[PDB]
């Protein structure tokens, strides 16, 4: 965290953005240790439509691990490079980490109902379609269609290649920035 | 300690000092990168304004942002110099910090962007040198206390009906709510005026043959009233029993019980002398105006909040009662009237005259009385007069923050108010971005985004 | 105000109509 | 409950706790009995505080 | 005994008001030992009381108000001799107006 010694070295980033990352960093959290409470209204002000703490309380536990009850910039710019910048392989890995709540690697059909209807919750009440109860646990079984019907990390991560929404989704940000 | 590191080669003449007395090895020094001091000055930027020192003076500290080596990432190669983007007079005490080793805090500067930037260059906050401490935790205090009134967190199936009964204005509902019991408590205690009056209700014009007990109807019906209002509240309290220790609560609950306590005792065995008392207490349904005006409830935050040096008056009162009354009483002890009998009887004449109310009922007649009657009432002046503006005031300031309250709280609605409106301003900005100077077009996209992601779009 | 004024004159109704029952229960007991 | 007892009524009570209020005086009508002291001068002092 | 100055202890003022305190009963005792002056006791019965004063350790804001007299000395002197202008004026003007 020595801002050399974490260069393109664990962290495939150019000192020259990351200079800049480090100081819109601690901008917002002087104290260089960012709570999960100060990760909600960073991230809600994003979106002038319905809240969004819902979901980054669940990105949050994601991205501090050991449960620190708070993440350091080591932490932070090691997750944010493998996304942006990281490899495809190691880009879903952590994302299957994300959707895992039950500790263990393990689905059981329950942790993907919260995150749907939290990803679901940030157009409130102005979309087209007009949401309803049923809408989230729709959405819920669609994704249901594409994990495994035999009774999984394996099979997510080699039908994730399958499905080139996935492939072609993943590199509008791995090329840029 | 690494603060004073200018001055090993002190200390290096101080080893000097134990060789010949020394039996070992020697281990020789673990050498150096340079054994100088060229380390130029570098020139730390802040903002436009250039601040230049020495190396060594940075590294002297090694725990802050400026030691150690946290700052790299300021560090700007490409033209050599490191750059901060904070405020240049505030830093300016920062680095003043390094030099001395310990900082200070300007008379008239914001404590919110000092405490922010002092934190930032990740030095503790108690580093003051005692010297502007006695101000810096002074304003620190009033802004947190500031911030503590700015987390008044009011909010508005009966969890909310009984907090909008609470409510004091609710127009048709709480107003009518306590008006009728504002004129209820009023008719009341003006019943247990006028129910001693000799026409009203005594044995005034009826010894030559109106006396009409009325009044007993009156005081249960308002007693009942009294009782169902509380049931409502026994209903109404979050905390069943854990509430009932409230002040107004208590207030309350005193203000029904002698009623009750009267009706068990009429049918109870009859006790001489005993009801007077309880008659006393119908006088009490006056407190219950405390919730009609705020003063009320301001004096008893002034009462309870300057309650320490109140016994201090009771403590110096009764010293300057027992003084002067036992001076009293055998100055003249012996006299014509000798109306001083006894020291409890002198008391009411060094209370009388010590509140500089003033009688006759009882005056001194001895020289030796007027000399110490005089002294006795300056006495009073002083010490009456000496706790009084550690109650007004402290009354008046207490007043003073219920009013700030009220303004920074309206103050905090209109923010929250334009917080949201610049809010539907973003959303109508990429509504209309959808339908026809970067970061808004970024964003936009990563909305865009969202839309695939979740198949529904946005509209008005 | 003009608002609060007539639901002010509609309380002072219902607190004269308790006092009126107040009356009639005096009257009750006359002597 | 007095031999002279000059506190015929509240109503006349009123002249007295209004004089004793204010810290004016006048003797006219006083206490007599312990029970009466206590609360004049304690109505004295409430009266310097209001 | 534990007494860091053998006199100086007594030159302060607490010192003093302990031994006004203890005095009048010895002093009476050696009185009515030897003596029965009319008028001495009931002065020794009045000096009986100054304990109120011994109250003063226990009492925090006593040696407050104790420094704040002694503070504002002049303040008190300019009282005192205000006091006696008007007593004296007036009062002459009072005899002269009234007898």
């Known amino acids: ?68 009850g708070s993440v350091k910039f080591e932490d932070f710019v090691t997750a944010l490079s493998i996304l942006l910048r990281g490899t495809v392989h190691e880009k879903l890995r952590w994302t299957f980490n994300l959707y895992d709540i039950n500790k263990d690697g393990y689905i059981n059909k329950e942790e993907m109902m919260d995150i749907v209807k939290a990803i679901y919750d940030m157009m409130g009440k102005y979309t087209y379609p007009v949401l309803k109860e049923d809408t989230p646990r729709q959405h819920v079984d669609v994704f249901f269609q594409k994990m495994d019907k035999n009774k999984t990390l394996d099979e997510f991560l080699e039908s994730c290649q399958e499905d080139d929404n996935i492939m072609r989704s993943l590199q509008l940000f791995q090329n840029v920035m | 300690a690494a603060g004073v590191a200018a001055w090993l080669p002190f200390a290096r003449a101080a080893a000097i000092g134990w060789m010949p007395v020394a039996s070992g090895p020697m281990p020789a020094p673990p050498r150096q990168e340079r054994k100088r001091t060229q380390d130029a000055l570098i020139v730390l930027n802040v903002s436009g304004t250039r601040f230049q020192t020495w190396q060594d003076t940075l590294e002297r500290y090694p725990d802050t942002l400026l030691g150690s080596s946290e700052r790299d990432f300021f560090y700007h190669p490409e033209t050599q110099q490191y750059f901060f983007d904070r405020d240049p007079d505030i830093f300016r005490h920062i680095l003043n910090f390094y030099r001395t080793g310990k900082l200070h805090y300007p008379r008239h500067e914001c404590i919110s962007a000092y405490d922010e930037e002092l934190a930032f260059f990740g030095l503790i906050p108690e580093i003051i040198g005692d010297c ?107 905390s069943r ?67 320490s040096e ?31 009998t006894s020291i409890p009887a002198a008391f009411w004449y060094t209370i009388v005259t010590m509140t500089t109310l003033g009688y006759g009922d009882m005056v001194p007649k001895t020289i030796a009385g007027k000399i110490f009657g005089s002294i006795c009432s300056l006495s009073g002046v002083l010490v009456i007069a000496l706790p009084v503006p550690v109650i007004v005031s402290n009354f008046s300031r207490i007043y003073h923050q219920n009013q700030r309250a009220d303004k920074r709280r309206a103050q905090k609605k209109a923010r929250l108010a334009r917080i949201r409106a610049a809010k539907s301003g973003s959303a109508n900005a990429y509504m209309q971005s959808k339908r026809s100077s970067s970061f808004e077009t970024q964003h936009h996209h990563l909305l865009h985004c969202l839309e695939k992601t979740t198949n529904h779009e946005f509209v008005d | 105000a003009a608002a609060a004024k007539g639901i002010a004159i509609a309380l002072l109704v219902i607190l004269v109509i308790c006092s009126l029952i107040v009356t009639s229960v005096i009257l009750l007991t006359p002597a």
């Open chain 1, 1 to 68: 965290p020595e801002g050399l010694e974490q260069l393109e070295a664990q962290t495939n980033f150019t000192k020259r953005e990351l200079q800049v990352l480090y100081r819109g960093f601690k901008n917002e959290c002087p104290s260089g240790v960012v709570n999960e409470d100060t990760f909600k209204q960073i991230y809600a002000q994003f979106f002038p439509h319905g809240d969004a703490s819902t979901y980054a309380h669940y990105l949050f536990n994601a991205f501090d691990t050991t449960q620190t």
């Open chain 2, 132 to 238: 502007c401490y006695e101000e810096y935790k002074d304003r620190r205090r009033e802004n947190a206390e500031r911030l503590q009134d700015d987390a008044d967190t009011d909010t508005a199936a009966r969890q909310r009906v009984w907090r909008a009964f609470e409510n004091p204005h609710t127009s048709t509902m709480a107003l009518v709510f306590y008006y009728v019991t504002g004129f209820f408590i009023a008719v009341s205690v003006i019943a247990n005026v006028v129910e001693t009056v000799p026409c009203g209700s005594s044995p005034g014009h009826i010894k030559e043959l109106r006396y009409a007990v009325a009044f007993f109807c009156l005081d249960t019906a308002c007693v009942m009233i009294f009782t169902v209002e509380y049931l409502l509240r026994l209903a109404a309290a979050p």
């Open chain 2, 241 to 307: 029993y854990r509430f009932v220790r409230s002040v107004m609560s208590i207030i309350d609950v005193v203000a029904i019980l002698p009623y009750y306590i009267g009706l068990v005792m009429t049918d109870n065995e009859d006790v001489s002398g005993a009801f007077v008392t309880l008659r006393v207490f119908r006088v009490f349904r006056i407190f219950k105006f405390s919730r009609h005006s705020q003063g009320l409830r301001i004096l008893g935050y002034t009462l309870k909040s300057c309650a």
């Open chain 2, 310 to 340: 109140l016994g201090f008056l009771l403590f110096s009162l009764t010293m300057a009662i027992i003084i002067f009354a036992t001076v009293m009483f055998y100055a003249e002890k012996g006299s014509s009237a000798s109306k001083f």
